[PDB]
Structure 1
Amino acid sequence: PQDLSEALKEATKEVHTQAENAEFMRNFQKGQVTRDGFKLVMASLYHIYVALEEEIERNKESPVFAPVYFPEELHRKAALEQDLAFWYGPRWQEVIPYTPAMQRYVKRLHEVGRTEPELLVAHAYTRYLGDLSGGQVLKKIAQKALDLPSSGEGLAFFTFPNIASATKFKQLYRSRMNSLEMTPAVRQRVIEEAKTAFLLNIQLFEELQELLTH
């Protein structure tokens, strides 16, 4: 369509369903998520956001990204650090896994941020708008299945404290995305990069599912 935000949503409808159908995600949705499985998901998110946010900081003043730069409202690294200290303990940095599928995702994020910055918006869209939009449903399931202790920690990732209304922010973020100026060639590569982002998540899900079935 005309608006990039609408173009992205329509172009990734197929791959989003592919993600919903992923065996690992099917189990999650059926409420069949285990503590070991959830831990792997949180570790994955930590590596992904560390890379994404490092690249966002590198390109925050570039015209290809500045319009969608919302550090305070969206940053997730600190929240994940808090969560991993709960899930993996005080020495989480020394024990969290960093698997090949996690590395493939991180590698692409760095390649984009360092050599193809104009495509970073595709990854910011896929991750941020995705976790913002589906965070409520994804969290509700986890907490009711994890039966975790009332220790007030472990799920900070699912709350964006600097966004008072997800509805208002998503409209603003979409408006900013649509304000970005890019050639038709770039626009097509951004759309493709968004699909690539979903595929990287899907391959990660497949790897995690394999690691858990031994």
Structure 2
Amino acid sequence: ADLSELLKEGTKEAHDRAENTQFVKDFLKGNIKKELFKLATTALYFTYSALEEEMERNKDHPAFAPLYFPMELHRKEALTKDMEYFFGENWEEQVQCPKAAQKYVERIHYIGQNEPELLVAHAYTRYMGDLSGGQVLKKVAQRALKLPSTGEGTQFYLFENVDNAQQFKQLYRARMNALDLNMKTKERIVEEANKAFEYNMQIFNELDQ
């Protein structure tokens, strides 16, 4: 079957575990105060910074190059703005990567440097979720925190260079299923995605405390 298919089925339960953590629920209800939201944005910054560094490094690698979309997908810049908006211009001296997130960052660097054919598992669990879910999460954060409607602190959640999010998701999926992969590597990808989803849950749990 198709890689995108194995991932939708092989990760549904890990995706749901992550989706049902106490952090996520109180997020969707508007009950996450500013300081916790900043800590969560801090974790997105180090996480996406590592992931996009590894995708840049492997931008020509045949098992990944078709999915390299810096203009459409990359989040480091938008996350830099949000960090500047919440912390001030000296933000980098003020933050430190959360410990659970440091474990995800280490995993991302390992994959991009030793098994780049697995990098797709990490881009899928992050960017495809962000594309379809974005605008919903954006408004919740703007309300709960009285964020300016001009978009400050919330730019992570807007993909300005993607004009039809459900259309880009199709393009991305089509390219993924066209990758030259045997069934061995494909199910490696599927369990690497489950790995990634569990890393997300570990970060949500560290954030709940």
In structure 2, relative to structure 1, the CA distance for the partners of 1:110 and 1:23 (3 Å cut) is same
**Counterpart of 1:67?**
66
- The CA deviation at 1:149 is 4.0
In the alignment, structure 1 segments of 5+ residues that lack a partner are none
- RMSD after superposition: 1.1
Q: Which moved more, 1:26-35 or 1:172-181?
A: 26-35
Which amino acid in 2 is paired with 1:129?
M
Map Cα deviations across residues 6-49 of structure 1 (whole Å, 9 max, x no partner).
21111111111111211111111222111111101111110011
**Counterpart of 1:38?**
37
1:15 aligns with 2:14: yes
Which amino acid in 2 is paired with 1:86?
Y
**Counterpart of 2:154?**
155
What is the TM-score normalised by the length of structure 1?
0.94
SS of the residue 2:88 aligns to: coil
Map Cα deviations across residues 61-109 of structure 1 (whole Å, 9 max, x no partner).
1111011111111011011001100011111100123121110010000
**Counterpart of 2:27?**
28
In structure 2, relative to structure 1, the CA distance for the partners of 1:163 and 1:193 (3 Å cut) is same
In structure 2, relative to structure 1, the CA distance for the partners of 1:149 and 1:164 (3 Å cut) is closer
Q: Is the 8 A contact 1:67 1:179 kept in 2?
A: no
**Counterpart of 1:49?**
48
- The CA deviation at 1:150 is 5.1
Q: Is the 8 A contact 1:40 1:97 kept in 2?
A: no
What is the TM-score normalised by the length of structure 2?
0.96
Percent identity for Structure 1 against Structure 2:
56
CA distance in 2, matches of 1:97, 1:21: 26
State the 4+ residue runs in structure 1 displaced beyond 2 angstroms. Answer: 148-152
Which amino acid in 1 is paired with 2:38?
K
SS of the residue 1:118 aligns to: helix
Which amino acid in 2 is paired with 1:166?
A
**Counterpart of 1:182?**
181
SS of the residue 2:79 aligns to: helix
**Counterpart of 1:100?**
99
CA distance in 2, matches of 1:150, 1:133: 20
**Counterpart of 2:116?**
117
**Counterpart of 1:3?**
2
In structure 2, relative to structure 1, the CA distance for the partners of 1:152 and 1:127 (3 Å cut) is closer
